């Protein structure tokens, strides 16, 4: 099967890793690069240029006071100023728009490994 190291969150064949740190938008990408991994991806499923679904191993883990950086989600744009984060509305994490150059927490995601 897949698994994932320490301290990630597997899901499928991916492991998210939550990044406290503050940072922009542009910071939050190099910092998942650094990891060999990248910004989460929740682009599907999504009906509305807002709707995000999230695998509850993920969403439990986040703390509902922060917005956290993800990739932007290239099918509901027409490059741009602002990019992507998820904020928690009531009950329902949204995906929002914000200037990159903000400072939020983020959620980089990595391949899974398998193991024989």
């Not at 542009?26 to 999230?54: G, H, I, M, N, R």
Request: glycine letters at 2%.
């Amino acid at each position: 099967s897949h698994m994932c190291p320490s301290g990630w969150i597997p899901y499928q064949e991916r492991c998210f890793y939550i990044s406290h740190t503050l940072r922009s938008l542009e910071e939050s990408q190099k910092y998942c690069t650094s990891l060999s991994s990248k910004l989460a991806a929740f682009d599907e499923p999504s009906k509305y240029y807002y709707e995000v679904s999230l695998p509850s191993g993920l969403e439990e883990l986040l703390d509902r006071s922060k917005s956290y950086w993800i990739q932007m989600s290239k099918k509901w744009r027409h490059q741009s100023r602002y990019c992507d984060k998820i904020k928690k509305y009531y009950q329902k994490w949204k995906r929002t728009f914000s200037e990159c150059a903000e400072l939020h927490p983020s959620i980089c995601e990595s391949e899974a490994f398998r193991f024989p």
